[PDB]
Amino acid sequence: ARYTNGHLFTTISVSGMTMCYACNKSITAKEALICPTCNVTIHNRCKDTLANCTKVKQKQQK
Amino acid sequence: MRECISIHVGQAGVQIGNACWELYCLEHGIQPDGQMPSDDSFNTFFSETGAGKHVPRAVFVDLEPTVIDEVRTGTYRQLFHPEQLITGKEDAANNYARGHYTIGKEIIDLVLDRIRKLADQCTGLQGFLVFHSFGGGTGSGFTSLLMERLSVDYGKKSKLEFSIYPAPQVSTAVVEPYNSILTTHTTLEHSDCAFMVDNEAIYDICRRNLDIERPTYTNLNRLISQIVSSITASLRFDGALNVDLTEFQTNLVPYPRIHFPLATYAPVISAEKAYHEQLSVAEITNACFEPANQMVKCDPRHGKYMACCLLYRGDVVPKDVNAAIATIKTKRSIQFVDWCPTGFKVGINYQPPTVVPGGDLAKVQRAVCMLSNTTAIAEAWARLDHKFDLMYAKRAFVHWYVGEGMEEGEFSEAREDMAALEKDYEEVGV
Amino acid sequence: MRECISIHVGQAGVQIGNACWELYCLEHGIQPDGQMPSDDSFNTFFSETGAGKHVPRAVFVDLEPTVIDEVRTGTYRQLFHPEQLITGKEDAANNYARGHYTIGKEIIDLVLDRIRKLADQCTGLQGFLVFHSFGGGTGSGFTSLLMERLSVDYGKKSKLEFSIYPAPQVSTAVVEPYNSILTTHTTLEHSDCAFMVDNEAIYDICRRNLDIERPTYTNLNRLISQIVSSITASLRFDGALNVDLTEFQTNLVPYPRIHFPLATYAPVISAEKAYHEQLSVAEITNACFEPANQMVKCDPRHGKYMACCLLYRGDVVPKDVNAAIATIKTKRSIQFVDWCPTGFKVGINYQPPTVVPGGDLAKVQRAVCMLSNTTAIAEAWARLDHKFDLMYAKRAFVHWYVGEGMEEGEFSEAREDMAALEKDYEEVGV
Amino acid sequence: MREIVHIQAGQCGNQIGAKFWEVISDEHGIDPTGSYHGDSDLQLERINVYYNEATGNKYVPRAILVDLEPGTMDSVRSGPFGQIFRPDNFVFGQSGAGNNWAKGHYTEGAELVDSVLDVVRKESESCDCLQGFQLTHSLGGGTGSGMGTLLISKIREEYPDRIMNTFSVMPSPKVSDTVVEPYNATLSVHQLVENTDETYSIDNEALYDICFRTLKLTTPTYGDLNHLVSATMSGVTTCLRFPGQLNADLRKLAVNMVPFPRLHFFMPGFAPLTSRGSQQYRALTVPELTQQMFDSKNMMAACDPRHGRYLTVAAIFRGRMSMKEVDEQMLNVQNKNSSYFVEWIPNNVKTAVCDIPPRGLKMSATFIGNSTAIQELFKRISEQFTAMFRRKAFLHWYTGEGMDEMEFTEAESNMNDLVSEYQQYQ
Amino acid sequence: MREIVHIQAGQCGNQIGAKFWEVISDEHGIDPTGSYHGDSDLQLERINVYYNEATGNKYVPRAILVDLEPGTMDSVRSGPFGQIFRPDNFVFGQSGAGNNWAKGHYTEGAELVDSVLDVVRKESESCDCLQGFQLTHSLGGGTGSGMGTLLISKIREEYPDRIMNTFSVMPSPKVSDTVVEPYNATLSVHQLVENTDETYSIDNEALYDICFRTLKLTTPTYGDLNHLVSATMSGVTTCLRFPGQLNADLRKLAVNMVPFPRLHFFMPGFAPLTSRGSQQYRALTVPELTQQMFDSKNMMAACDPRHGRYLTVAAIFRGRMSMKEVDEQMLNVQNKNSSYFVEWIPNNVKTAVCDIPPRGLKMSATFIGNSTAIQELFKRISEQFTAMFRRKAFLHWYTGEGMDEMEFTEAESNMNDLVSEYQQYQ
Numbered sequence A: 001a002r003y004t005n006g007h008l009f010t011t012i013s014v015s016g017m018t019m020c021y022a023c024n025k026s027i028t029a030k031e032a033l034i035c036p037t038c039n040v041t042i043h044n045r046c047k048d049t050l051a052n053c054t055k056v057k058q059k060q061q062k
Numbered sequence B, C: 001m002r003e004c005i006s007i008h009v010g011q012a013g014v015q016i017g018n019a020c021w022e023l024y025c026l027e028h029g030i031q032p033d034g035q036m037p038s039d040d041s042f043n044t045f046f047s048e049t050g051a052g053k054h055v056p057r058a059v060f061v062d063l064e065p066t067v068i069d070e071v072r073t074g075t076y077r078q079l080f081h082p083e084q085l086i087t088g089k090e091d092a093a094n095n096y097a098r099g100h101y102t103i104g105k106e107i108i109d110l111v112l113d114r115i116r117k118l119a120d121q122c123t124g125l126q127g128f129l130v131f132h133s134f135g136g137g138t139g140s141g142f143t144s145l146l147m148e149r150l151s152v153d154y155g156k157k158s159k160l161e162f163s164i165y166p167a168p169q170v171s172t173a174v175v176e177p178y179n180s181i182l183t184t185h186t187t188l189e190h191s192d193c194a195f196m197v198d199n200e201a202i203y204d205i206c207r208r209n210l211d212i213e214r215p216t217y218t219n220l221n222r223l224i225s226q227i228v229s230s231i232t233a234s235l236r237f238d239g240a241l242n243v244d245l246t247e248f249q250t251n252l253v254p255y256p257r258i259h260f261p262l263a264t265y266a267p268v269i270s271a272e273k274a275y276h277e278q279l280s281v282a283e284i285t286n287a288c289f290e291p292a293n294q295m296v297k298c299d300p301r302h303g304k305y306m307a308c309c310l311l312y313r314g315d316v317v318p319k320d321v322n323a324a325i326a327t328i329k330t331k332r333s334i335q336f337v338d339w340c341p342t343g344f345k346v347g348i349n350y351q352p353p354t355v356v357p358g359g360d361l362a363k364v365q366r367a368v369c370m371l372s373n374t375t376a377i378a379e380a381w382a383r384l385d386h387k388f389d390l391m392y393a394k395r396a397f398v399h400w401y402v403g404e405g406m407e408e409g410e411f412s413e414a415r416e417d418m419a420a421l422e423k424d425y426e427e428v429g430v
Numbered sequence D, E: 001m002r003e004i005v006h007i008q009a010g011q012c013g014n015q016i017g018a019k020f021w022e023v024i025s026d027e028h029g030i031d032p033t034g035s036y037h038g039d040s041d042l043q044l045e046r047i048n049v050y051y052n053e054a055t056g057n058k059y060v061p062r063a064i065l066v067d068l069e070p071g072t073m074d075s076v077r078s079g080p081f082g083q084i085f086r087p088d089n090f091v092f093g094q095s096g097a098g099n100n101w102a103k104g105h106y107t108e109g110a111e112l113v114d115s116v117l118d119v120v121r122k123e124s125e126s127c128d129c130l131q132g133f134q135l136t137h138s139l140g141g142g143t144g145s146g147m148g149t150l151l152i153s154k155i156r157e158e159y160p161d162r163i164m165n166t167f168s169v170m171p172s173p174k175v176s177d178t179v180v181e182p183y184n185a186t187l188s189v190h191q192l193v194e195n196t197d198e199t200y201s202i203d204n205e206a207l208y209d210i211c212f213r214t215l216k217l218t219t220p221t222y223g224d225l226n227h228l229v230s231a232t233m234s235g236v237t238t239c240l241r242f243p244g245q246l247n248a249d250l251r252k253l254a255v256n257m258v259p260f261p262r263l264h265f266f267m268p269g270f271a272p273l274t275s276r277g278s279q280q281y282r283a284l285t286v287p288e289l290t291q292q293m294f295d296s297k298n299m300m301a302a303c304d305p306r307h308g309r310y311l312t313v314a315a316i317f318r319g320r321m322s323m324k325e326v327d328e329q330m331l332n333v334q335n336k337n338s339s340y341f342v343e344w345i346p347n348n349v350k351t352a353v354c355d356i357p358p359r360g361l362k363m364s365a366t367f368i369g370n371s372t373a374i375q376e377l378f379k380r381i382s383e384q385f386t387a388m389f390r391r392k393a394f395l396h397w398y399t400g401e402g403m404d405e406m407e408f409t410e411a412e413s414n415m416n417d418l419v420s421e422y423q424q425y426q
């Protein structure tokens, strides 16, 4: 299906104060991606810039 | 002649039916209390009595009384036959084992009795329109219990289903994966074509197109009713290409087990937006193939279309359907499998879509309902079984099931079966 | 047939479009609400919907909601399609990086969808009418983002672009040179005919001819709208010499990159003045060639004319035109390049100019719009890059740009690229 | 149609039950006399759930009042709503418990249990479809902590299949009012873990915290604490008394909230809760409610849930709201606070919605949470008991009633088993 | 839509802010009670910028009030527009700062900051699209100079990309009211230079000068000074609340005004300003309002601009005027006074124009100037600091809260760095 860096990205309805996982900026639109394993959210414009799933999820476990 | 039996199970199915018969009464001009002021267009769904009263061909069942107590008190109290509104005593409590083995056991013999009485009034019965929810305790257990009997008593008759399917992120119960995984055996063995539907997809559609920020469940029901009305329009009305209910399955289903098509409707549009565009046949045809308009949260681009039925209704000319389908074919985004060079079934009906007076959906001279057997829906199952695997690894909530007369191994035997189904949709994708 | 898509970007572009669509609706007799009380003259700019309503072929985009919110509340609320009026969340803040890389990247996929749906309606599309400002953050970043996408999606179609350009003395922002020098890549690589205009020249025009001491931006927009209406007049109306949108470029553009003609209009005059003077063809033809009537503050005598397009509209006859250009050649002031002995493209249209009722432009039987590729415009670049060099020498304002995903080196590559363009406009001058 | 048998035990149980009947008779529009005076038909549609109809159009609550001292019966009977209860349902002895668990379980309450069950059987027999039992008591003291568990054992034996629902006010250290609470608590939890199907742990310190830091009452009395508990009491059973878009029976709650057989001790809460002087400024909409629920201050146990993770949460909304908003807020809560939910359950939030909000509120919502942080409440009591039992302090009063030290040791062993089980999945 | 979170700290900040709300609510047509009563729809179009909607159409100012003494809260709450604010945002301790920066930053304010950030987070979460922060404080004393900078550091850490906008009343030699002002100012600006994006320097001496030699007020009180400051407060945020011919967002102002990252300390001003007995004689035409703008007597800081040159100036007009007249007049000012502008920036003047003038005025305009001459204000305070620190006077009060002389040395070193940077270009 989709493994650009190595995980799923499915649409989520985004609200309130949020931040990209790569830009570390704020998302303005009401759309966002989300990996159910990595538990992140991105602009829809930084999908290829992230690391692979293994990197991000092993990072998330600090 | 050309009758259909519409059974409604679970709260979701019962409320969808409450919307659906509301739509039909407006369609055929029948009053909410069952009379008809002034063709046999109503003969498919309504049986006629000597007093001028049209009684629906429906059976409402729920093991708890609340929803059917509401319908027995609502505006449509006078529409239904009193003894086809069947109620139990104990709520299924979101448990497949209760709905199938213990509490749904008692009420099944009366439900099949009423179905038999409805059937005996038919001259040319064609199939069944079962409405239920995958997550619900009654919506899984009772539908399995009922279908195991229906497949042996009326085996030849086709059986069409309309199912609300668990979503990626939206979820209203914790054991939804178990309940769906147990409903899979019914939908595999004793079914012919079942239509998945997802709440979050319609939520996003209503947010984007209808411009309502926060809809209730009635809005979802008023679109699912529109879809089923579009399916049955060829059966209730005249048309250029009337699609029979068995012709329908013969086009949709390539293999015995591959029968889980997506459904979508167009033009889903508000009343304010509609004044500023034309809604030609080409535009509405292109609308169905966007990911923005699918009623299941899955990307069609990640799979291959296998078979698409376009049911046009209203002021549609077949020239336009031809030109639209050619335009669809030239696109390299909409990919079909190599072994189905034909692809598209087309039906055209002369009845425009009816707007519910309190509804939001605009009036349009045309409508197209697109149903697509496609491989992308496999990813919708690859989601849900992965939700199961985490829980059964811990034997998380199993004691409630096993405690109510269920065998433990049925879990594994269920998980195996979907592993065969999810394989097959990939296996035919080559 | 013969359609054009009008995209308006930035506050300046949006307000110019507000003037332009006000000028077109009166020219074709369309009410502000889109209806037509009573010939396919409007077909180029307006799409016609079965209710008898004309919807303009336009896309309004601004990354801050203010200006388009005024458009959505003003008198032309009912004219535009509500969904093609696109608004973002955050202001570009006069920053090329914010418009191009950071904020506009979210809305580009929506504006391209709007443009695609507009194009799918168009049967005989020719090109694009992009209105924007070089000084603005949106008007520089978003146009750069959008033109690159259009040049790959619709590479064959023409792309006419209309611009407000920084002036010698008058200016409203500090980093206008940065935005302009960054926009120069877009104009060079993905455009075919960009029409420079500046505020100071039109101000001086209103002071001298229209006898208004202190006008607003609306007065300038009511002249820019007149210029573009004169350009499209050959397309929307019958004429003796109808100039096609591609023929127009074929006569204007001698080399791939020399595509920045000046524009001017005549007779710009007040209602009081015109009664005292005749305004025959010869005098208006002369009126185009003085330094006073240029819309960019440069002296045409300093640069050799390369190509001129005289678009006459109204009660004009070819005899008088040929007589007037005979004198314009006879002059020693209206100089020309040795290698273009034809020089003058002529178009004639039978429709007189339309006067807006609240405007301060007089009614006149004849009008002429002169659009001239000439070397003198190089001086205008020799101005603005010198404004860049002082600031970029200190890295005066750079940290805002680099803070929003912009590579520092792209500044030098921009300054390099303009050094090639100003060379070219000089290199052909020998 | 899904009837509930209510039982009061002990002073605290009797008081909270009396306030519960206050609240729900107000909901159903029942007069102090027992005569219906409500406005809507939905009040009377499911009146059989909590009341028995009797002639003259009177409604007697299906409540059983048990206490080993006549003082509490004289208090409730002379109270604002004392007259409603059936005089046959007042079962009481004379000599009090003396804050002794063994007195309640073996000597004083063992005589009266035979009378209590013979009444509870009558109310079960008059019922059309009994669903479960709704008991009120306290694990401190001797009457509730022992006698309510004895009655729990007997009812579990007689009705093995019905749901059993208990609401317990339990001891906290800083607000302790009796010396021997650890003994009674460790002896009562040993039964509650085994027989009861759910248990809603209520702590006085947390309700005082609600009264002070959220409500801003200057002098909160026990009546206000009982009001707060009765709010969630009426909240949880709302789905089987009014219509709704998502109906959740108590068994429906039990199936989704109880993963393993013994991890059923829940932490309740209520929203909205605002001071009188500040309600004019707030927007009651669903996002603000959802913010107010999952705040650690709003919950009714001293456990700060950030020291653990939720196995399951249940939000029972009442009022008119769109389902999209409710599900969106429930999704954002668990995904923004993903560290505080167990990741071996993919979805942790159950949602139910009813169309009748409380009288005076356009919307309300009851929070239930099964969290591992409850172990801290179950840890500290065990740490208290070890302080006393190590030196056998005050074991003479308990051993005089025939009780043994091996029972205390087994009770604490079961306590450590339960706290270990709650710790295992954290 | 470009929502702004406002915060008040210290007595001076709370006062000038309590005034800001009275003046910005005058431009919004909001009743003292919080009910809308304005004339035009344009007032209500962008009410969300500085307020939150609540039931009954009551608009509550998105404002956080912070102070270490209850007295200022008592005065503001009992003040004219006191009841408009939310009671919950009144976050305050008991013991005052005692005009000590260390108490504000380390000991007393460090306790309360955990409370203030949680309310700021609530306001930020309720917002649709937040743009930046609008803090009012004074660099004198201990409450403002310490706690405002602590809060700025925290918010800058939590919201790195949002604008931070402070308005600073800062010391002057001849109008000093506290002995330890230089220490507090030196420790506060050492934070402001690093964290803030736009800091507007205000001085009481210049405010008195405007009151005396422009307004001809005989007895100007502190209320008049707060009025004068609040004029520019309302002026700068005009473009994102009303329609205009040239819209200038605060980020647009920042992108145009701040050449290098640390040279962002601006000098405000306002026009027109006339005595009540002489307004009948003036013509309010653009040139006349702009004639007063660039007069050295009209700006709000003691720095006479004639000892320096302007990096950038921003003129935000309000009312109906022609664009050509505006452009001519700004060209003439910077051409005839070319010696007072840096030549390495070719154009120094940003112009913004709003279509809606202030109530009661036909025309108005707000002036911002980033001038090198501001160094004289940062120089003189340092010259005071070096007077005391060289003999360690009053240092025991600061080291008693855990502070060190090394911090004072780095604060002074950073001050010298800032003044050197401002001087390097002049």
Ligand SMILES: CC(=O)O[C@H]1C(=O)[C@@]2(C)[C@H]([C@H](OC(=O)c3ccccc3)[C@]3(O)C[C@H](OC(=O)[C@H](O)[C@@H](NC(=O)c4ccccc4)c4ccccc4)C(C)=C1C3(C)C)[C@]1(OC(C)=O)CO[C@@H]1C[C@@H]2O
Pocket: D022, D023, D026, D027, D215, D224, D225, D227, D228, D230, D231, D232, D234, D235, D272, D273, D274, D275, D276, D279, D358, D359, D360, D361
């Ligand atoms: C205008 C207005 O807002 O009035 C409210 C009110 O001011 C507030 C503060 C009420 C008020 O509650 C309290 O003051 C209170 C004090 C101690 C303990 C518990 C409550 C109220 O008394 C409580 C009362 O609640 C009800 O009527 C509910 O139906 C409640 N029943 C009772 O309180 C009740 C009282 C006497 C006799 C019988 C019932 C209920 C709660 C849960 C389930 C079913 C019913 C209401 C509307 C209010 C007042 C009157 C001020 C609050 O109560 C509830 C449960 O909503 C406390 O915070 C909430 C939020 C409300 O805004």
Ligand SMILES: CC(=O)O[C@H]1C(=O)[C@@]2(C)[C@H]([C@H](OC(=O)c3ccccc3)[C@]3(O)C[C@H](OC(=O)[C@H](O)[C@@H](NC(=O)c4ccccc4)c4ccccc4)C(C)=C1C3(C)C)[C@]1(OC(C)=O)CO[C@@H]1C[C@@H]2O
Pocket: E022, E023, E026, E027, E215, E224, E225, E227, E228, E230, E231, E232, E234, E235, E272, E273, E274, E275, E276, E279, E358, E359, E360, E361
């Ligand atoms: C007939 C006439 O000319 O009346 C004027 C006036 O006389 C003068 C002197 C006013 C007047 O201002 C003062 O007296 C004053 C005194 C001390 C400090 C500041 C002002 C006026 O009070 C001030 C008042 O201004 C406003 O209403 C503005 O909207 C202002 N808002 C407030 O002053 C205000 C007062 C109370 C409560 C709420 C708001 C404003 C300024 C900037 C941004 C937004 C709003 C006006 C028109 C006048 C009077 C009434 C005499 C002046 O004020 C302004 C900002 O216009 C002071 O010099 C100007 C020029 C005016 O000519």
Ligand SMILES: Nc1nc2c(ncn2[C@@H]2O[C@H](COP(=O)(O)OP(=O)(O)OP(=O)(O)O)[C@@H](O)[C@H]2O)c(=O)[nH]1
Pocket: B009, B010, B011, B012, B015, B016, B063, B091, B092, B093, B094, B095, B133, B134, B135, B136, B137, B138, B139, B140, B164, B165, B166, B172, B173, B199, B217, B218, B220, B221, D245
């Ligand atoms: N679109 C839509 N979905 C509904 C509706 N009502 C319930 N559902 C869906 O049905 C799913 C849950 O199934 P249940 O409501 O438990 O169905 P049930 O058969 O009554 O289950 P039991 O109560 O245990 O017997 C959820 O995904 C709900 O979203 C409705 O009115 N409209």
Ligand SMILES: Nc1nc2c(ncn2[C@@H]2O[C@H](COP(=O)(O)OP(=O)(O)OP(=O)(O)O)[C@@H](O)[C@H]2O)c(=O)[nH]1
Pocket: C009, C010, C011, C012, C015, C016, C064, C091, C092, C093, C094, C095, C133, C134, C135, C136, C137, C138, C139, C140, C164, C165, C166, C171, C172, C173, C199, C217, C218, C220, C221, E245
């Ligand atoms: N003739 C005319 N020029 C305008 C108008 N509005 C703005 N401008 C000119 O446009 C230049 C500034 O460009 P901007 O207004 O910043 O364009 P923008 O895209 O909205 O800028 P951002 O908000 O940062 O995206 C200036 O030279 C103005 O003179 C107008 O209405 N008419």
Ligand SMILES: Nc1nc2c(ncn2[C@@H]2O[C@H](COP(=O)(O)OP(=O)(O)O)[C@@H](O)[C@H]2O)c(=O)[nH]1
Pocket: D009, D010, D011, D012, D013, D015, D016, D097, D098, D099, D100, D138, D140, D141, D142, D143, D144, D145, D169, D176, D177, D178, D204, D222, D223, D225, D226
């Ligand atoms: N919220 C509340 N708590 C009470 C009430 N009465 C007693 N309590 C508390 O709950 C505990 C119950 O103890 P108690 O019932 O008196 O002992 P018992 O009679 O032997 O069961 C007391 O220690 C008190 O801390 C009450 O009316 N309301």
Ligand SMILES: Nc1nc2c(ncn2[C@@H]2O[C@H](COP(=O)(O)OP(=O)(O)O)[C@@H](O)[C@H]2O)c(=O)[nH]1
Pocket: E009, E010, E011, E012, E013, E015, E016, E097, E098, E099, E100, E138, E140, E141, E142, E143, E144, E145, E169, E175, E176, E177, E178, E204, E222, E223, E225, E226
């Ligand atoms: N414009 C204005 N200045 C004030 C006001 N009150 C005090 N000031 C001045 O600003 C400075 C603030 O000092 P202060 O607030 O008392 O110290 P803090 O409370 O510890 O922050 C004083 O020294 C005064 O010079 C006021 O109400 N308005």
Ligand SMILES: [Mg+2]
Pocket: B010, B011, B062, B064, B091, B092, B136, B138, D247
């Ligand atoms: Mg159900």
Ligand SMILES: [Mg+2]
Pocket: C010, C011, C064, C092, C136, C138, E247
């Ligand atoms: Mg703009």
Ligand SMILES: [Zn+2]
Pocket: A020, A021, A022, A023, A024, A042, A043, A045, A046
């Ligand atoms: Zn990003």
Ligand SMILES: [Zn+2]
Pocket: A006, A007, A008, A035, A037, A038, A039, A052, A053, A054, A056, A057
């Ligand atoms: Zn991943």
